[PDB]
Amino acid sequence: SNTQAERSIIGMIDMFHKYTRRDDKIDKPSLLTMMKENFPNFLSACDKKGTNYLADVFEKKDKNEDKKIDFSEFLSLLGDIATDYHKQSHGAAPCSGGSQ
């Protein structure tokens, strides 16, 4: 059996895998679809403030400029999303970016 936290991690691995091609990496179209399918309420909050999160997410997160998102780069993206929810849990508005 798995705890909720274990299940969550396991599910994140599945989510990554779902959007990969045979090279175990995610291309730009698939990353954007992953975001719309899995983080629609996050994206709606960005839209509410006039921000298109999807305009530059791929290029910001493709750290090595190889036109693919690997697992490490995917984890950085999940960390950015989690950070936003963490800030909300201390009273911030959603989609606050905030790279000061």
Which segment (25-33, 50-58, 61-69, 83-91) binds its own copies by CB under 8 A?
A: 83-91
Which segment (25-33, 54-62, 77-85) binds its own copies by CB under 8 A?
A: 77-85
Per CB under 8 A, the list member of 27, 30, 33, 42 interacting with its own copies is 42
Burial class (CB within 10 angstroms; exposed 0-12, middle 13-18, buried 19+) of 53? buried
- Under rule CB under 8 A, residue 71 binds its own copies: yes
CA distance 93 to 40: 16
Annotated binding residue at 2? no
Per CB under 8 A, the list member of 22, 23, 41, 65 interacting with its own copies is 41
User: Which of 36, 44, 41, 46 is closest to 15 using CA atoms?
Assistant: 36
Burial class (CB within 10 angstroms; exposed 0-12, middle 13-18, buried 19+) of 31? buried
Shortest distance, CB of residue 13 to its own copies, whole angstroms?
Answer: 5
